[PDB]
Design a protein around this ligand. Structure first.
Ligand SMILES: O=C(Nc1ccc2c(c1)CNC2)c1cc(F)c2[nH]ccc2c1
Lengths: 39, 156
């Protein structure tokens, strides 16, 4: 049996830790909702 | 039980101790999460029960208590924040500029941040605080790292 617990408010925070890149990837989506890389 | 708007953890006691399987958004009395987190199963919120209302394995989404309410979309230009709620750790905003998943049916935004699979369902926000999608469904790159799509549902 799964349960839920509140973890916070949904707000944008100014001056948050900025990380991560912006890749452009060729993908396919199958009937099972699974993504795969196309090359 | 608790139906206040906000980000919530999805937990289970089926495994050893209490284990976090995912995250979800509570908005307008509707709990929104990814299908692979719950697999359409009923949820508990204290003494209350949350029954599924809508779901789709291909979109990998599911809503509880009512129809999907989140309709905001990535503008294709601006940075976004992932309000990551990782297992055993406090909720934390992480700003990034999304990339693009190019598909036969059009382009989707994509966030490239590394989090455990239990972080799935964590919302992605725009500068107004609006949920533009959920994190948890994407691809594994050459680096073994994960790149998730910005998955949004449809509001009717
Ligand atoms: O496996 C993941 N996600 C998923 C699982 C099962 C299914 C789907 C997506 C959609 N069809 C069924 C996942 C999610 C994450 F956030 C992650 N972070 C690192 C690795 C990883 C992996």
């Amino acid at each position: 049996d799964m349960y839920i617990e509140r973890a916070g408010d949904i707000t944008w925070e100014k001056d948050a830790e900025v990380t991560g890149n912006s890749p452009r990837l060729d993908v396919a989506l199958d009937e099972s909702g699974d993504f795969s890389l196309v090359e | 039980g608790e139906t206040t708007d906000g980000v919530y953890r999805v937990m289970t006691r089926r495994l050893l101790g209490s284990t976090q399987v995912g995250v979800g958004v509570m908005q307008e009395g509707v709990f929104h999460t990814m299908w692979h987190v719950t697999k359409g199963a009923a949820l508990r919120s204290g003494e209350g029960r949350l029954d599924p209302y809508w779901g789709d394995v291909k979109q990998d989404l599911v809503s509880y208590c009512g129809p999907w309410k989140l309709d905001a979309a990535w503008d294709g230009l601006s940075e976004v924040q992932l309000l990551a709620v990782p297992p055993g750790e406090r909720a934390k905003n992480i700003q990034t500029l999304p990339g693009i998943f190019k598909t036969k049916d059009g382009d989707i935004g994509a966030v490239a941040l590394d989090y455990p699979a239990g972080t799935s369902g964590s919302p992605i926000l725009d500068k107004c605080g609006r949920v533009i999608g959920l994190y948890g469904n994407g691809v594994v790159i050459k680096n073994g790292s994960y790149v998730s799509a910005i998955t949004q549902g449809k509001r009717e």
